[PDB]
Each structure stands twice: as structure tokens, then as C-alpha cells.
């Protein structure tokens, strides 16, 4: 979880994926 991306306007509906986990570390 060292990698991430805090940006995508977090509203609720289809406005952003997540980008909060240990996946972008691959």
C-alpha cells in the first residue's frame, strides 16, 4: 500500500474508482 493516488473526486456514484489498496504496488 506504499503506492496510491489520492485525487479522483470522491463523491459516491460513478465519479471515481478507488485507488486505495495494495494493488498499485505491483
Virtual torsion, Cα 10, 12, 16, 21, nearest 10 deg: 80
What are the residues whose beta carbons fall under 8 Å from the beta carbon of 24, sequence distance 6 or more? 3, 4, 5
Distances (CA, A) of 24 to 8, 12, 13, 14: 15, 21, 22, 20
Q: Which residue has the cell 485507488?
A: 19
Counting DSSP H helices and E strands in the chain, the numbers are: 0, 0
What are 26's three cell numbers? 505491483
Distance CA 5, CA 8 (A): 8
**Which residue, among 15, 13, 23, has the nearest Cα to 5 in the 3D structure?**
23
Distance CA 13, CA 4 (A): 20
Amino acid at each position: 500500500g506504499n503506492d496510491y493516488e489520492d485525487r479522483y473526486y470522491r463523491e459516491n456514484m460513478y465519479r471515481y474508482p478507488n485507488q486505495v489498496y495494495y494493488r498499485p504496488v505491483c
